[PDB]
Swiss-Prot record, chains B, D:
Residues 72-159 form the Fe2OG dioxygenase domain. It comes from Shewanella baltica (strain OS155 / ATCC BAA-1091). Its cofactor is Fe(2+); L-ascorbate. This is PKHD-type hydroxylase Sbal_3634. SUPFAM superfamilies: Clavaminate synthase-like (SSF51197).
Amino acid sequence: LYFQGMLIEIPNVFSKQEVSHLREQLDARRWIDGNQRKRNQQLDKDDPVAVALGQQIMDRLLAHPQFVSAALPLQFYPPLFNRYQGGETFGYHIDNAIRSTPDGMIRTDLSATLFLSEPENYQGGELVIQDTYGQQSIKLSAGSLVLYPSSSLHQVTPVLSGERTAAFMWLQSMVRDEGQRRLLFQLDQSIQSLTAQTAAEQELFNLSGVYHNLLRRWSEL
Amino acid sequence: NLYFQGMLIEIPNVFSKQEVSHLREQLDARRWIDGRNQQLDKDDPVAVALGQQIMDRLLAHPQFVSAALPLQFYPPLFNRYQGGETFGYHIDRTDLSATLFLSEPENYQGGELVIQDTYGQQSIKLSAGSLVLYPSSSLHQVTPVLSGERTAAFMWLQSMVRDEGQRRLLFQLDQSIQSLTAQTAAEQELFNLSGVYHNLLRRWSEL
Amino acid sequence: NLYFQGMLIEIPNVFSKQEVSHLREQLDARRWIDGNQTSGAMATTRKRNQQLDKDDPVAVALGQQIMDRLLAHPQFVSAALPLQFYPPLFNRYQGGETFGYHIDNAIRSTPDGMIRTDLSATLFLSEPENYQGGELVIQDTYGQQSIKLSAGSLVLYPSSSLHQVTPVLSGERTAAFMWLQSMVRDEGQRRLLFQLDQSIQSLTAQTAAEQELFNLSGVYHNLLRRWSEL
Amino acid sequence: NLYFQGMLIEIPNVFSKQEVSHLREQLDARRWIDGRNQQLDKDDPVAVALGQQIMDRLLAHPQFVSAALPLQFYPPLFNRYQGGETFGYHIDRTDLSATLFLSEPENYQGGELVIQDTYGQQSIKLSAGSLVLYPSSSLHQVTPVLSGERTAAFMWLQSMVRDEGQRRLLFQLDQSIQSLTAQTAAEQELFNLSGVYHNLLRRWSEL
Amino acid sequence: LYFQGMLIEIPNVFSKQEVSHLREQLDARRWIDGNQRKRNQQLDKDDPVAVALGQQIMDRLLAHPQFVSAALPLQFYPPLFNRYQGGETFGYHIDNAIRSTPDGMIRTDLSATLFLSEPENYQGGELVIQDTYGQQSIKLSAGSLVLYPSSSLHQVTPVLSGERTAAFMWLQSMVRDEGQRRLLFQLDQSIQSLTAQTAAEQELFNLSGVYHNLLRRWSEL
Amino acid sequence: NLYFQGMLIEIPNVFSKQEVSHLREQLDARRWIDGNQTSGAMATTRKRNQQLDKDDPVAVALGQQIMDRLLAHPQFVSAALPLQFYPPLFNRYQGGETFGYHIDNAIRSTPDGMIRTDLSATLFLSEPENYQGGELVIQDTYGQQSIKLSAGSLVLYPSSSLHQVTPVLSGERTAAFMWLQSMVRDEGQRRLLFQLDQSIQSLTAQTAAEQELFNLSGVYHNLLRRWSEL
Ligand code: NI
Ligand code: NI
Ligand code: NI
Ligand code: NI
Ligand code: NI
Ligand code: NI
């Protein structure tokens, strides 16, 4: 779990075997073209395999304690499967703050990309994110996830060779403010480390009480 | 660009003159009930259908979407004022109220939508096909129509941003970003400003 | 006139003895499922008890009767200012069954969406004299308390407390447990509202000047409006 | 008990009629400057001394102290309106503004202190020796005095509670506690209510 | 350091020897009577010995880390020296939320009594405090301090035998909200215990960072 | 056009080289006092350096010249939105002198009252090439950075950071350090204001339509008003 700047990497969300089973199912579906500057391919949002596998990705992420701690998810925009090859790219843009989903409107606090192609198997296709804190290129291993704020100016550089398949999504967090969400995450991770280091049980409970209190003060459901 | 006249915004030419005639042709053929003013029944099928057309047109209007940040519409109602008919001072979650004018302001005497502000009040009668958008909490009235007739569509809506000041600040920021986009201003600054806009929208929105 | 015991409040006689008996007659004829698994505690907890399935029709129905009764109880409404309940769950403790020290999760999922757990509540459905042990021990910054109330009484307490149900070594403890999100998030604000309300009620009972009662009610409703998050 | 007439409070009989005559006797002997109305110089020693007497009397008045929760006074100024003299609509940290009336309202034509509210506006002319207290942010005017003369003391002050609504809620709570104290209500409830009052004052005060 | 309910006891703020030296100085001064229902004795606020020794009490309290942690003092109402004997008492009352001091107005967040008589040496003179949380009688050892919220309904019961000398004061905290102030105190004390238990330095720093952040979010200076 | 490096910002050439030289000439002739004692760090810290006394007249005077210069610097004002400074202190590091890992206190006392330490700042008064070591290492949740800037440049950073000054093993590092309370408490808000301001300045330099510049400035001032605590 790497906390490189403003963005967080969750490695091995799915295994290499699970990624292959995901790809065998996804590759069989009908990849539709589009320009919605952008030129790439996607599975239709209502494709039943896309819907089913997107639910599997959400279930898996919701079963990951570090993901849950870092993002405190309230509601996901259902995963969207995308593909970039032969010069396909998504130019610099800012994501909209509000997005319409099948179960109402959500505030896009965080964006997330699950990689379904190995980085060595495609030239280009880097996810470049740019903020007031800085700039980074992201091209993680198949099964790994990058979680980043939706406010970032970003792009997917052209894939000049091979192909890049990934699941993309947005999510509304229970904690709106990034500063508050990072403080909670910091406190939770200290509690986890102290638990692993066998610290006094009374202090683990006291700190967990502080955490509970802050989450109760700052959450918006 | 189109600014805010204090605490209220005018969206001109939501419908063309030809379109407004076509709306009036359909509306005028319906049964107007004496409910002091007049109106079409909320469940009148032509009122419900034109109400839906008004909503679709408004949601397709970037300036309206930006000004209101609509979350939920309450279906438009159709009213009419003539021969001394008026609506006294009153306050009407409805965040915003709107009137789409369906009669030209010159074709009737009186019938001014008077809306109170912090600084005083504003009297509004816009061109047929134009809309006025204002906070539902504002004290307001429709002065008597002593000659001619005033037909209009009136509606309420929940906004994504409940605070009036926050909603205008966002609108002004958005409107300036568009104007700079038409002027071909530096890309990096257009992005930096949009970033500021979306950050404020993330801070202030309630869905 | 009800008062807090530190950070908790007891609401007595929510159901009569005869109603508790009828509730038990219905509950006892259902399928009680052994549970050694925690759900709702912040860290891993040593739990061993019996429960009715959350979707048991009789459990759902009586859960609704409990919520309906609580919503009709003026002192419960004043103390908790309920916005949304996590539907009541029925649990039982006997033969060494216990729920170890833990803190309840701040956020819980319910069928009608996610709620913030402002307050926890237990409706007692066995008489405290009829079982040994089974004390709800609630600990916080401002002290510690052991609670076993009369059948049909309810205890209301913050979900943030460090708490446990000590082992029941003889007899059986049956109860309905729940959480709720209050209209008022902050505990200090919610307690000030309860205090103001309760004073208005005492002054009403004492036959105080109606204009003063009216004015104080106006103050109460203005505060409630300012501090509520609906 | 004495309630709030919407967003403004009237404090009657701050000074008696005899005392008001004594204040006017001293004030009327001074040099009034044409600064459209009139006033005494801020550094006029009799104006400064009577200004201090007004402040002392007000700070000794439980209803005023409770209504304003004064933190800091800006020294009272003395104005006069006659023969068409008026003060147009305007907004004036000054939290509150106050006028102590030094002429009987019947002894002059016009000269109404008009103050805008959320619901509309209020026209105020009180008895000599009475005071009106209102938010400084309120839009207001003094209508022309067409006959007789209107002498008054006007002042601003920082309150301990900046929010108008919070300040009225506290005042109403306090006023009800006093009334119940005069009625010999149960001691325990009088204490419980005072506890609620002081808790709100602790939450809302800015010193 | 006992956290009995809503109130906190700080024992041995001054030693028994220091209390005797305080009392030798205080007993020489002119004790003035008054009814400001109340009947007790006090030293005049402008008595130079009272002013000097009050400063010593504030200096000592500001040098006590647990006092500083619990109260987070911003400004004190200078200590007032009081004495109860021969039926003298202070009946049930609520302290005013706002108090005027020589250096401006303060909000009375907390009240505090430093005991300068041993409890065994006077019959009665109990400080009875009553809140929504409950009720307590307080009559601590000479040199010990009780710190309690100023919102409490309270009294000093009559002293029927001997005498009770004490320093009383109010203080405005940097953190207005009691709930927030207790959470900070809880977090600080966990950090101190973990430091004493030799927990990983990185976690002590992380938790101290959380504390710093919360104090910066909630303080009012 | 200045930009943040993660959570910190460098303001270059606050004073010219000639002015830094004149500042050093005045500072060097004063009495430097050996200090092994921490003041302003949250926990006990291993510190060993030299400082000028806080009440040294020349230190007070040059501290005022530094604050005056910073207040006249548009980019410093935009980044920090200063409300109140803790008056600058002059420190020096040589011959193994260092300031170990610590976090600065959230609240500091000053002669004109208590301040909240929103931001920390160091004005460099030795060239980074003229000493070995003495890097200001600033660490937080979002990364770590080592800073040694040109003489007369300033680094501005959050006081919440875990940070140290690594040992100076050759030459000497002289600097002025300070804290400040910003008009805007929240760092996220303060950064959004800086971003908006800086864009308006770039658009001004690019000769953008004056009505748009005016409108954007109105937005900026409305935000500043909403988020300031004066
Ligand atoms: Ni994107
Ligand atoms: Ni209306
Ligand atoms: Ni529990
Ligand atoms: Ni005025
Ligand atoms: Ni007292
Ligand atoms: Ni430091």
